Amino acid sequence: MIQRTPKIQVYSRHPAENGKSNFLNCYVSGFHPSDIEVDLLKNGERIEKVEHSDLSFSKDWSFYLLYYTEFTPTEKSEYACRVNHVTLSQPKIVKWDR
């Protein structure tokens, strides 16, 4: 058996075809087992309609998840990614560094 703690990155990207669009991304990488819970948060509340959840693996024991959706950030709100995994004794909340 092997278990590996996810690395968690939270960032925004504008698709080059539409600069008015902005995506909030949680990139959860290098984890095992594949069991996981990932949410995007706005002001600590789970964002319910996340448009994209892309799972892959490299080696049989390394998984990668890109979890992302359209958003319109303001100065008045806080955005984050929350991850639960067996390797994490408490939920890990990673704030967006703008």
Please give the domain boundaries of the chain with CATH numbers for all domains: 7-95 (2.60.40.10)
Tell me if 70 sits within 8 A of 18, measured CB to CB. no
Which resolution in angstroms does this entry have? 1.1
What order of strands is seen across the sheet that includes strand 52-57?
Answer: 7-13, 23-31, 63-70, 52-57
User: 33: buried, middle or exposed (CB in 10 Å: 19+, 13-18, 0-12)?
Assistant: middle
Please name the method used to determine this structure: X-ray
Tell me if 74 sits within 8 A of 17, measured CB to CB. no
Tokens of 85: 């995994």
